[PDB]
Structure 1
Amino acid sequence: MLDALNQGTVNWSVDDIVKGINSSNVENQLQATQAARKLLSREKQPPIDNIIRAGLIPKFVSFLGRTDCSPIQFESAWALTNIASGTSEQTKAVVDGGAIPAFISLLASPHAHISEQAVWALGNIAGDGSVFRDLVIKYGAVDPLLALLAVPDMSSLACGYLRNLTWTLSNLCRNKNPAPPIDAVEQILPTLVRLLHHDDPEVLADTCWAISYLTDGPNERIGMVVKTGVVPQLVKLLGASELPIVTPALRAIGNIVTGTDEQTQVVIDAGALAVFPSLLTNPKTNIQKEATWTMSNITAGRQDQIQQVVNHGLVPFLVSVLSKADFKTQKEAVWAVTNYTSGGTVEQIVYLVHCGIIEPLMNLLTAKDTKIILVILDAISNIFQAAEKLGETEKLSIMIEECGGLDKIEALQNHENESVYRASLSLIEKYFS
């Protein structure tokens, strides 16, 4: 019944656990609790419902408060968490048994490894959905969670512990319907901001993820993030060599430029455009895709913003990706071109055409995707409008003819797709007759 660690074992019955856990002997209570966490920590087929049916949750929860015996606090935190990591109903049973406030009080243990358990517990529950997340917040988890990081140097804290607390904060930032209560976000941001200057790769990755969640919302949310001055540091991390940093850094920058024109300018002012050559030629196609998407949202902005895209020499990269990247990225490149031609100046559209946008664009008119064809034709239209202003519609017509583009446009003349038939007929009637 005891192993060579003097702990309870997986060989204890529920009968045994119930007896031990109800004893006045503290060592017996601890062994019963160890036997329970060992049973419940089996990855596969843990007998969670048997422990719940033995009415044991309220007892495990009161053990969380047993300062006289930190190992009992640890072992019961562990068991409860394992229970909570099960079905939604199993989690709901842990919560209904009062575990959240008890975990929150446990953050005050002067034992790092105990307060660490509480952080871990609350992270698990918070991430079990928006509803639990809000319960964790409503019960007051935020203040004590942050107080653990209110120290002079974060580096006084062990890497493991910091990783664990950062992970838990990012779950308080995660999910929608509904999104995190705004005042909790206000409270948390300044700490995330300090975390982005820490130099542990996993801490940085977790914090970038949290920021990406906060920036996935209405502009009010984007603004809050932007107003902290993190954007520059986010841009620095875009440059990081670690893909697990670059990926959420990129998502966050991508989200921010879906915001207002001023919000996008903060991104440009921080020097993001300079990182785009390495992103747009990054072997990971997901990065190319996210990067091109971001670029599509910058070329949807103002003319002096489009001008910075040009000034950083990014247009040939865009041509390159429109030509010879995987299709999902090519779709973002179509958007980037359509946006750029929708808002750019005449001179900017002349430059885009001199970079050789036309052939790659025309080639995509064989795509079997109606949305994409209609957008490409929209882009074609915008380029023609600029040629009108120079009285050069005809020289563009000729550029389109020679790279096989008039053929691809003629090929859309099929009534089976009435939408595509009309778009393409009009274009043919106006500039190819």
Structure 2
Amino acid sequence: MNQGTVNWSVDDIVKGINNVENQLQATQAARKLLSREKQPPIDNIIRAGLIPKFVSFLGRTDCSPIQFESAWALTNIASGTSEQTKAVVDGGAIPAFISLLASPHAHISEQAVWALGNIAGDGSVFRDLVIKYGAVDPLLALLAVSSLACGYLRNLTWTLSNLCRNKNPAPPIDAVEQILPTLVRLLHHDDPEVLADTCWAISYLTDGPNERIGMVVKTGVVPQLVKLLGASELPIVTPALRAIGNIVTGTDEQTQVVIDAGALAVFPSLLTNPKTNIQKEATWTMSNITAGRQDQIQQVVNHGLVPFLVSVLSKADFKTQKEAVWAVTNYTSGGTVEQIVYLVHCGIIEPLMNLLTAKDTKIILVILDAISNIFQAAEKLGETEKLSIMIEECGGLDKIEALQNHENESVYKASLSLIEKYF
């Protein structure tokens, strides 16, 4: 005998499922099996032809308890790998869960939303597959007209994010134009666990071409995404920082928006943040900002950000410096001459030189590329030599020459052209 519906043998559950009070305790037995702490017997249950039986319990319009107990079970089976989640899909379960959304029972539809989120959250296929089954309307409808439950709301915000995540292909554009509006009013909620999955859902959307990003920008969420960057709960900043950092990777006009949102006032704190991973992203977004037009670069300057980049490059670890490097390179690229001087005046020389030893030959090519930029700016000032001297007095000239005898052909071609043209 089993003590209650705890730790039933697989042989028992099958016998109980095949009276409804048996089918209920058995379905519940599978539930407790599929939700145990250690390695759930997901493989064993699927090979017992139980999956199809669980589908019927969903359509139990009369027996509420077994609908819930069953949905719970399947959900913990679609939580496994891609092959296990497939078996559920193959069992025509997708159409069923979308039908369980209608249920007046709070514990059922909420358990159906979750159930759908797992299936869609699998890959791009099952995502679009679920969306094709027109699950967008009901799920969004469950958000029509607070004061709704707290825990429930999260499962929706999560399942929705899984309807935007992953690429190749990207979630149907029409399925986004309709979901976005919802993701906006949600963005103005109060619950962290909800605001978190919100930003994630947004970042997923803004993880593509300028059209996708355009959709998310023309909705007016941007000003809010920057309002959360300063928030305390770290699980809120990361998802929003990505959403923002991904926005700037688009058009120059899509940057002037996030810049006018007040992002250039938060970065100073974002950079000197103890959380190292937040430094990387922060200074990463910095690059795409300085990559834009000139006047925009002139705004990165106005907010005294440059002196920060220097420190982010002269003290911070490597992965944050690699980004601080691009931010400097792009800066010198599109930047103006009177801005280049201001960058040299901030002592960008030595800090930039010290990195001419890294093992990543790519970052090296970039630094040389950034050097040439400063020189071409120095040329139109007739101060060609004056610059060369600085790069020499700080050992830089040696670091550049040490490249002459490097393994990468490009590094030689590049380090040599610099030595020749300006030395």
| 1:118-169 deviations in Å (ceiling 9; x for gaps) | 1111111111222211221111111110111111xxx211211111110110
Distance 2:10 2:284 in 1: 56
The answer (yes or no) to whether the contact 1:209–1:248 under 8 Å persists in 2 is yes
SS at match of 2:196: helix
The answer (yes or no) to whether the contact 2:7–2:32 under 8 Å persists in 1 is no
Distance 1:212 1:11, change over 3 A: closer
Distance 2:49 2:217 in 1: 49
Distance 1:355 1:161, change over 3 A: same
Specify which of 1, 13, 18 is matched with residue 17 of structure 1: 13
Distance 2:193 2:80 in 1: 26
Moved more, 397-406 or 120-129: 397-406
The CA RMSD over aligned residues, in Å, is 1.9
The answer (yes or no) to whether the contact 1:7–1:31 under 8 Å persists in 2 is no
Specify which of 299, 308, 314 is matched with residue 290 of structure 2: 299
Distance 1:8 1:63, change over 3 A: farther
> Do structure 1's residue 336 and structure 2's residue 309 form an aligned pair?
no
Q: Give aligned pairs, total.
A: 423
SS at match of 2:178: helix
The answer (yes or no) to whether the contact 1:106–1:115 under 8 Å persists in 2 is yes
Percentage of pairs with the same residue: 100
Distance 1:150 1:80 in 2: 27
Distance 1:228 1:416, change over 3 A: closer
| 1:277-335 deviations in Å (ceiling 9; x for gaps) | 00111111111110111110111110011011001110000111111111111111111
Distance 1:337 1:9 in 2: 63
Distance 1:325 1:207 in 2: 31
Q: How far apart are residue 252 of structure 1 and its match?
A: 1.0
Distance 1:353 1:145 in 2: 55
| 1:228-272 deviations in Å (ceiling 9; x for gaps) | 000000010111111111111111111111100111111111111
Q: How far apart are residue 34 of structure 1 and its match?
A: 1.1
Distance 1:82 1:422 in 2: 58
Distance 2:43 2:56 in 1: 19
Distance 1:315 1:275 in 2: 14
Alignment TM-score, normalising by the size of structure 1: 0.93
Specify which of 141, 144, 149 is matched with residue 150 of structure 1: 144
1:354-393 paired onto structure 2 within 5 Å: 354-393=345-384
Distance 2:51 2:393 in 1: 76
1:61-210 paired onto structure 2 within 5 Å: 61-151=55-145, 155-210=146-201
Distance 1:47 1:332, change over 3 A: closer
Q: How far apart are residue 45 of structure 1 and its match?
A: 4.4
Distance 1:173 1:162 in 2: 17
Distance 2:236 2:96 in 1: 34
Distance 1:322 1:90 in 2: 47
The answer (yes or no) to whether the contact 2:392–2:398 under 8 Å persists in 1 is yes
Distance 1:159 1:404 in 2: 61
The answer (yes or no) to whether the contact 1:365–1:373 under 8 Å persists in 2 is yes
Distance 2:7 2:407 in 1: 71
Q: How far apart are residue 14 of structure 1 and its match?
A: 4.4
Q: How far apart are residue 403 of structure 1 and its match?
A: 1.8
The answer (yes or no) to whether the contact 1:10–1:36 under 8 Å persists in 2 is no
Q: How far apart are residue 84 of structure 1 and its match?
A: 2.0
Distance 2:8 2:37 in 1: 18
Q: How far apart are residue 183 of structure 1 and its match?
A: 1.1
Q: How far apart are residue 416 of structure 1 and its match?
A: 4.1
The answer (yes or no) to whether the contact 1:8–1:32 under 8 Å persists in 2 is no
Distance 2:133 2:401 in 1: 65
SS at match of 1:305: helix
Distance 2:378 2:83 in 1: 64
Moved more, 341-350 or 29-38: 29-38
Q: How far apart are residue 421 of structure 1 and its match?
A: 2.3
Distance 1:7 1:116 in 2: 29
Distance 1:389 1:49, change over 3 A: closer
Distance 2:296 2:36 in 1: 55
Alignment TM-score, normalising by the size of structure 2: 0.96
The answer (yes or no) to whether the contact 1:83–1:90 under 8 Å persists in 2 is yes
Distance 1:12 1:205, change over 3 A: closer
Distance 1:11 1:197, change over 3 A: closer
> Do structure 1's residue 283 and structure 2's residue 279 form an aligned pair?
no
The answer (yes or no) to whether the contact 1:209–1:249 under 8 Å persists in 2 is yes
SS at match of 2:84: helix
The answer (yes or no) to whether the contact 2:289–2:297 under 8 Å persists in 1 is yes
Q: Gaps (5+ residues) in structure 2?
A: none
Distance 1:150 1:415, change over 3 A: closer
The equivalent residue for 2:397 is 406
Distance 1:156 1:295 in 2: 39
The answer (yes or no) to whether the contact 2:312–2:321 under 8 Å persists in 1 is yes
Q: How far apart are residue 42 of structure 1 and its match?
A: 3.0
Q: How far apart are residue 343 of structure 1 and its match?
A: 0.4
Moved more, 315-324 or 85-94: 85-94
The answer (yes or no) to whether the contact 1:293–1:336 under 8 Å persists in 2 is yes
Moved more, 250-259 or 392-401: 392-401
| 1:10-34 deviations in Å (ceiling 9; x for gaps) | 4544454344323xx3323212211
Q: Gaps (5+ residues) in structure 1?
A: none
Moved more, 66-75 or 80-89: 80-89
The equivalent residue for 2:32 is 38
